[PDB]
Amino acid sequence: TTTTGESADPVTTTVENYGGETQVQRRHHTDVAFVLDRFVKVTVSDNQHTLDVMQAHKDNIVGALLRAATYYFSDLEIAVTHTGKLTWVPNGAPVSALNNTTNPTAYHKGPVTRLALPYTAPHRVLATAYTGAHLPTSFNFGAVKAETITELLVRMKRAELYCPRPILPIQPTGDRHKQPLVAPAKQ
Amino acid sequence: TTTTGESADPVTTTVENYGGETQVQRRHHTDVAFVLDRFVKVTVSDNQHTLDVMQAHKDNIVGALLRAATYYFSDLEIAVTHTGKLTWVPNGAPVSALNNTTNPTAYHKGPVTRLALPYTAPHRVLATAYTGAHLPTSFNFGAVKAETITELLVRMKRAELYCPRPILPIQPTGDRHKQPLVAPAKQ
Amino acid sequence: MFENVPYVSTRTDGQRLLAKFDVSLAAKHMSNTYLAGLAQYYTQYTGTINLHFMFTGPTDAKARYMVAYVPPGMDAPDNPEEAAHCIHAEWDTGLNSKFTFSIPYISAADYTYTASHEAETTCVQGWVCVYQITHGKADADALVVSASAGKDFELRLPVDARQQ
Amino acid sequence: DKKTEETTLLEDRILTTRNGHTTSTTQSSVGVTFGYATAEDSTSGPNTSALETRVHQAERFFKMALFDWVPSQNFGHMHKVVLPHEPKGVYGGLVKSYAYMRNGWDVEVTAVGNQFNGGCLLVALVPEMGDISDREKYQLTLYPHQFINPRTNMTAHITVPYVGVNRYDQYKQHRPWTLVVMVVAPLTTNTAGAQQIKVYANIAPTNVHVAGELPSKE
Amino acid sequence: DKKTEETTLLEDRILTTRNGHTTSTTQSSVGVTFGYATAEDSTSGPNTSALETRVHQAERFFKMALFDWVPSQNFGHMHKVVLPHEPKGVYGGLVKSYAYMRNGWDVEVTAVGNQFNGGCLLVALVPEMGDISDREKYQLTLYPHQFINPRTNMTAHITVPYVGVNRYDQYKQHRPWTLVVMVVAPLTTNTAGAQQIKVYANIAPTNVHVAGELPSKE
Amino acid sequence: SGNTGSIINNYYMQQYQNSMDTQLGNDWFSKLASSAFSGLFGALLA
Amino acid sequence: SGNTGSIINNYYMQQYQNSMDTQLGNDWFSKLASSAFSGLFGALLA
């Protein structure tokens, strides 16, 4: 199957060309909405933290995959292990609000406290990159504050992605990257 | 009822031959799917453990009965008494994954933590034996890791068995194997 | 990738083995490949993989190539005549710069690992070697290669094994 | 099986088997035992991207010897072997040229002695057989089997399907079938029995399919 | 054959050939010359008591080199070879296991140089070729042939049927086909030609039938 | 099926509760047990 | 939609569970993947 390579028009041959027989697939697992729909730890440093998905580890499935797109939309779900009252505040709220309790404040019930929050930016969509680097103030989902924030996780719901960006693995030392895989106890 | 014995073709006579009258049975209890559908303790040694059904005791009902077949399929259910976060990883995952929390990780809620897991091998079915001994890496249901793993149990759901293998009892010393059976208090 | 570069270079005229590699998404040659960067998050896979060879030479440079898929069981042959016995495809240069070719999923199990075990010496899924049969005025010239996912190519069982 | 004439003092229950251009008549059959099924699963799986093919030529008979049954060897004495073992001819050639393959077995084991011998052998085929205990020789009947007993028959015939956790195998490092033969009643010789019995096998690889043509130097 | 886009400075007349799991694309075909017929005579003669069989696996491509065409060798310089010659792989295996056999040839000879060379080769297949005289090289065109001429094409393709005074042969001591290549116009090199031209062959045994299975030690 | 006896259906979809099987194309010992000869083979008197 | 598998509907209104989208006026790579040439471009023999 010769093509004019310069074209940039997609080409996909099949085993049928030599006599094989292409089968069926179920790429459920490689579905955007699906893969990103799980919790990811985000490194919290203070007892107050602005919610931002870019803070997931760049090599963590979710963060790696989120960064494999340039623009994205989604709602949020959060799981915080905290102490005292947890207060959330919507994108663009004066930071001073975090102390006020008439804002969505959840009392303690350990271990974690789980919530569902609405996309709250004022743009039609948000971005992974930006050339106008360091991302803009407004690219957040609000902020959280609790007397103590031991741990923080976030989950992207309803995810939409636009324009793919690259995504690299590990550069192997030798011919392939060998390593220890889950195996049964020797006995 | 004389038969050509060499044939190997099944023969089953009945009390009717001499005048008796064969009755009804309800072999619900001797049903594969059913007997194996219960929990069995598996000896965990570290704070991380690969899930494998061959690890049930060979004289334990489930393990004895599982080993009474050569090939098997089933989904899993697990009950772990652990500490901290329990993380599971699918068959063929680099062991290094057990530390990552974006994988199916369950927080603590004592005593035990119960889960339902999908058969996750890449073969059409798995085996009890193998002549190609010591069973292959891939014959597992993934692996688990938690700061502390006090105890571990597994339950086979949807069990299918193929080709029967033998299953022996105790070799009695004398004419029969006598022993203490559950009886009422003497008084 | 072949040591910092995407192409393969015509060493000299004649039966030369231009490249040969492992059929794993871990393979060194993949590495910079989207397919591999993606596969790194699933334990298993099945499917056809497509190889694309775009000849970059000048109008006066002509060549003929061969590509084969060497299933495991032997050692990857270093010359066409030995490789001529595997599923292969020969082709020359012309108006059409590009040539695509599918790498068949032929394994014992229905699925296979994206990941590579330590215990595996040889690439569980064989290799693909690409030769040159001959050429003329084609020395020096680049044959850049890329890879895309095939139609029936599938990725399953998401996993998060990496640093943090 | 059955024969005519009428009754007689000799044998009957005739049966001719044929695979490829090879036959095998036996005037003392006891029937043929069928495996774990009557037909193999789908021969064209996804695991072969349907590049698999089948070779009719392989499906033919090939002989290979087992052992000599003598009065010495008593109960539980057993002779096992994994098929294919060293394979020759066409069938053998396949193994050297294809990465993966699969096939079942047509086994005809023949312990020719004479009707005045006593004693009895048990012949079976086992999936993933990995060393039986002494006790579990007693439960060997759970496998596709057939007895040879001098007063009755000379040949035991068992046909069996390909099995395995994989639709296709690499015989070069996993075979599922292991043909075994065990003494259950030690060989009797009496006045006119045969001193000892030579045991052979007539085998045919059934429904042979191969996939993944390998490179070649010769 | 033909290609699109429009016209251009490069090549077109594309053609892909396929035998078994092997293909061979060529953006500079000149068509394919057909033998002495379009279909072989009856493959199942009396001489085979109809025990013959056909092997689809053999019918695949196999490569083998010819020679290097250089400006030195001038008119009449010829390189001949009898097919099969040393045969490897599946096809080869047949020869070692069957007494008699037959097949035709799918030959694709490829002298890859470059369009600035002058010169021209003549490739043909000959039945029972037994050393031509110098004069009769001039009448070589009476055989299934095809020219390679740098200004025009890179590949010559000829398909041909099995022939012989016998429906089936013993390749081990008679082959009818002899592939030859001869220079008719010595290779020109000019300013930008290719110094020398490497000539290879891509062949496929067509419609392979075999009969009379031989004994075997391995 | 197995040791399961809830009368109400799972709250979760079966696509999550279990692994879904695929097909490509009642069993054996069951059939074999039944094909067992149970007569007499002789000729009965009285 | 995503990793969600409850068979029974949310106890809460969807107006509270999620953000409501507004419109003003099936997508792309999906379409593009399919428009891929898969033939031969040549002329096939045998």
Tab-separated table of C-alpha atoms in Angstrom, chain B:
chain	number	residue	atom	x	y	z
B	1	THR	CA	-25.248	-56.821	34.305
B	2	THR	CA	-22.302	-58.079	32.414
B	3	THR	CA	-20.459	-55.647	30.145
B	4	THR	CA	-17.311	-55.715	28.127
B	5	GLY	CA	-15.144	-54.114	30.825
B	6	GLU	CA	-12.323	-53.040	28.552
B	7	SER	CA	-14.641	-50.632	26.696
B	8	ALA	CA	-14.333	-47.816	29.261
B	9	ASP	CA	-17.951	-46.874	28.448
B	10	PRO	CA	-19.849	-45.906	31.624
B	11	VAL	CA	-22.160	-48.389	33.292
B	12	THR	CA	-24.534	-47.623	36.148
B	13	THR	CA	-26.868	-50.317	37.418
B	14	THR	CA	-29.736	-49.810	39.867
B	15	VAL	CA	-31.419	-51.444	42.794
B	16	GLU	CA	-34.179	-52.214	40.303
B	17	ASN	CA	-32.087	-55.111	39.036
B	18	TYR	CA	-32.968	-57.163	42.117
B	19	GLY	CA	-36.280	-55.546	42.874
B	20	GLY	CA	-35.454	-52.296	44.587
B	21	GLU	CA	-36.599	-48.843	43.630
B	22	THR	CA	-34.128	-46.055	42.832
B	23	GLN	CA	-35.168	-42.738	44.423
B	24	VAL	CA	-34.591	-39.008	43.916
B	25	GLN	CA	-31.552	-36.857	44.553
B	26	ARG	CA	-30.756	-33.206	44.921
B	27	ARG	CA	-27.078	-32.875	44.295
B	28	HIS	CA	-27.219	-29.076	44.800
B	29	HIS	CA	-24.434	-29.360	47.254
B	30	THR	CA	-22.175	-31.233	44.896
B	31	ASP	CA	-22.538	-28.481	42.277
B	32	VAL	CA	-19.228	-26.969	41.102
B	33	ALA	CA	-20.233	-23.300	40.903
B	34	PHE	CA	-21.775	-23.672	44.315
B	35	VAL	CA	-19.184	-25.494	46.449
B	36	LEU	CA	-16.323	-23.278	45.298
B	37	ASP	CA	-18.431	-20.115	45.944
B	38	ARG	CA	-17.106	-19.482	49.473
B	39	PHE	CA	-14.163	-17.812	51.205
B	40	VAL	CA	-10.906	-19.558	51.929
B	41	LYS	CA	-7.947	-18.295	53.927
B	42	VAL	CA	-4.721	-17.925	52.005
B	43	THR	CA	-1.371	-17.660	53.850
B	44	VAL	CA	-0.038	-14.167	53.317
B	45	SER	CA	3.590	-13.643	54.303
B	46	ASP	CA	4.513	-10.105	53.430
B	47	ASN	CA	2.575	-6.850	53.409
B	48	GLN	CA	2.183	-7.374	49.634
B	49	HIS	CA	0.793	-10.536	48.029
B	50	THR	CA	0.048	-11.804	44.511
B	51	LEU	CA	-3.543	-13.196	44.264
B	52	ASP	CA	-3.475	-16.854	43.290
B	53	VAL	CA	-6.068	-19.516	43.955
B	54	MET	CA	-3.562	-22.345	43.952
B	55	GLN	CA	-2.477	-21.001	47.337
B	56	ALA	CA	-5.504	-22.357	49.115
B	57	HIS	CA	-4.663	-25.383	51.231
B	58	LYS	CA	-4.614	-28.559	49.138
B	59	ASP	CA	-6.751	-30.330	51.712
B	60	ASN	CA	-9.173	-27.473	52.198
B	61	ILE	CA	-12.532	-28.057	50.550
B	62	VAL	CA	-12.076	-25.255	48.007
B	63	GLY	CA	-8.420	-26.004	47.205
B	64	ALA	CA	-8.988	-29.742	47.242
B	65	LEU	CA	-11.939	-29.320	44.897
B	66	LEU	CA	-10.264	-26.750	42.682
B	67	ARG	CA	-7.352	-29.183	42.286
B	68	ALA	CA	-9.900	-31.860	41.308
B	69	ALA	CA	-9.999	-30.094	37.919
B	70	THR	CA	-7.192	-29.291	35.506
B	71	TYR	CA	-8.453	-26.024	33.919
B	72	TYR	CA	-10.627	-23.394	35.503
B	73	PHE	CA	-12.213	-19.955	35.066
B	74	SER	CA	-13.745	-17.623	37.633
B	75	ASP	CA	-14.116	-14.116	38.928
B	76	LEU	CA	-12.855	-13.192	42.360
B	77	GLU	CA	-14.093	-11.658	45.537
B	78	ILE	CA	-11.559	-10.904	48.308
B	79	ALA	CA	-11.729	-10.156	52.031
B	80	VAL	CA	-8.588	-8.576	53.522
B	81	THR	CA	-7.980	-7.593	57.150
B	82	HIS	CA	-5.355	-4.895	56.595
B	83	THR	CA	-4.058	-1.516	57.756
B	84	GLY	CA	-3.708	1.750	55.884
B	85	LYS	CA	-4.532	1.781	52.187
B	86	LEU	CA	-5.120	-1.428	50.293
B	87	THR	CA	-4.179	-1.258	46.629
B	88	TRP	CA	-4.928	-3.782	43.961
B	89	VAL	CA	-3.279	-4.120	40.619
B	90	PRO	CA	-4.350	-6.164	37.522
B	91	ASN	CA	-2.576	-9.221	36.168
B	92	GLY	CA	0.636	-8.258	34.302
B	93	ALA	CA	1.150	-4.915	36.004
B	94	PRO	CA	4.672	-3.875	36.942
B	95	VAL	CA	5.049	-4.595	40.616
B	96	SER	CA	6.043	-0.953	41.122
B	97	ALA	CA	2.371	-0.105	40.634
B	98	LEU	CA	1.317	-1.413	44.042
B	99	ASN	CA	2.532	1.862	45.529
B	100	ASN	CA	0.419	4.035	43.304
B	101	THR	CA	-2.901	5.086	44.693
B	102	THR	CA	-4.746	5.963	41.422
B	103	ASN	CA	-5.013	2.175	41.054
B	104	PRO	CA	-7.985	0.564	42.786
B	105	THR	CA	-7.031	1.579	46.332
B	106	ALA	CA	-9.447	1.127	49.231
B	107	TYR	CA	-9.106	3.129	52.421
B	108	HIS	CA	-9.443	1.462	55.817
B	109	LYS	CA	-12.802	0.594	57.361
B	110	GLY	CA	-12.232	-2.275	59.712
B	111	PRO	CA	-12.359	-5.053	60.316
B	112	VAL	CA	-12.089	-6.449	56.819
B	113	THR	CA	-12.347	-4.819	53.430
B	114	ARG	CA	-14.358	-6.747	50.805
B	115	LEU	CA	-14.036	-6.426	47.012
B	116	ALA	CA	-15.203	-7.952	43.770
B	117	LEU	CA	-12.552	-8.341	41.120
B	118	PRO	CA	-12.715	-9.444	37.466
B	119	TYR	CA	-10.858	-12.437	36.086
B	120	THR	CA	-7.870	-10.629	34.686
B	121	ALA	CA	-5.475	-13.178	33.072
B	122	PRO	CA	-4.840	-13.102	29.275
B	123	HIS	CA	-5.592	-16.748	28.661
B	124	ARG	CA	-8.959	-18.169	27.788
B	125	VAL	CA	-8.790	-20.197	30.999
B	126	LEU	CA	-6.187	-20.971	33.693
B	127	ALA	CA	-4.712	-24.235	34.956
B	128	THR	CA	-4.209	-26.348	38.090
B	129	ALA	CA	-1.341	-28.325	36.499
B	130	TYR	CA	1.056	-27.712	33.620
B	131	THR	CA	3.681	-29.646	31.672
B	132	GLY	CA	5.695	-26.971	29.883
B	133	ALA	CA	6.504	-28.562	37.779
B	134	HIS	CA	5.969	-24.798	38.522
B	135	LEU	CA	3.055	-22.692	37.176
B	136	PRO	CA	3.573	-19.672	34.823
B	137	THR	CA	3.839	-16.030	35.892
B	138	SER	CA	0.578	-15.068	34.154
B	139	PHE	CA	-1.634	-17.475	36.166
B	140	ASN	CA	-2.728	-14.800	38.659
B	141	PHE	CA	-5.582	-12.403	39.481
B	142	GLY	CA	-3.344	-9.433	40.055
B	143	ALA	CA	-1.667	-8.426	43.306
B	144	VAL	CA	-2.463	-6.576	46.471
B	145	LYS	CA	-0.415	-4.353	48.831
B	146	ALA	CA	-1.282	-2.595	52.062
B	147	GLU	CA	0.920	-1.135	54.804
B	148	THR	CA	-0.166	-4.194	56.835
B	149	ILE	CA	-1.909	-7.384	55.702
B	150	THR	CA	-2.979	-9.320	58.787
B	151	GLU	CA	-5.199	-11.828	56.950
B	152	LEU	CA	-6.397	-12.726	53.467
B	153	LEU	CA	-9.348	-14.682	52.079
B	154	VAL	CA	-10.586	-15.273	48.556
B	155	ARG	CA	-13.851	-16.451	47.019
B	156	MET	CA	-14.291	-17.863	43.523
B	157	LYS	CA	-17.386	-16.562	41.714
B	158	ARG	CA	-18.788	-17.982	38.428
B	159	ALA	CA	-16.490	-21.017	38.593
B	160	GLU	CA	-16.081	-23.314	35.558
B	161	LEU	CA	-14.044	-26.539	35.695
B	162	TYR	CA	-12.624	-28.784	32.984
B	163	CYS	CA	-11.123	-32.273	32.974
B	164	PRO	CA	-11.250	-33.937	36.316
B	165	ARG	CA	-8.144	-34.740	38.330
B	166	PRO	CA	-8.100	-37.119	41.345
B	167	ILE	CA	-9.018	-36.195	44.922
B	168	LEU	CA	-7.958	-38.374	47.877
B	169	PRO	CA	-9.160	-38.557	51.503
B	170	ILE	CA	-7.156	-39.837	54.512
B	171	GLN	CA	-5.543	-43.290	54.359
B	172	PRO	CA	-7.024	-45.081	57.408
B	173	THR	CA	-4.798	-46.976	59.792
B	174	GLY	CA	-7.301	-49.736	60.514
B	175	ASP	CA	-10.439	-50.948	58.733
B	176	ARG	CA	-12.149	-47.539	58.661
B	177	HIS	CA	-11.255	-44.083	59.820
B	178	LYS	CA	-13.081	-43.475	63.118
B	179	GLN	CA	-13.064	-40.050	64.839
B	180	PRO	CA	-14.962	-37.565	67.107
B	181	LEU	CA	-18.057	-36.102	65.521
B	182	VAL	CA	-20.153	-33.208	66.767
B	183	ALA	CA	-22.374	-34.653	69.507
B	184	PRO	CA	-24.583	-33.225	72.282
B	185	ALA	CA	-23.192	-32.603	75.765
B	186	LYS	CA	-23.449	-35.899	77.711
B	187	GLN	CA	-25.215	-34.585	80.878
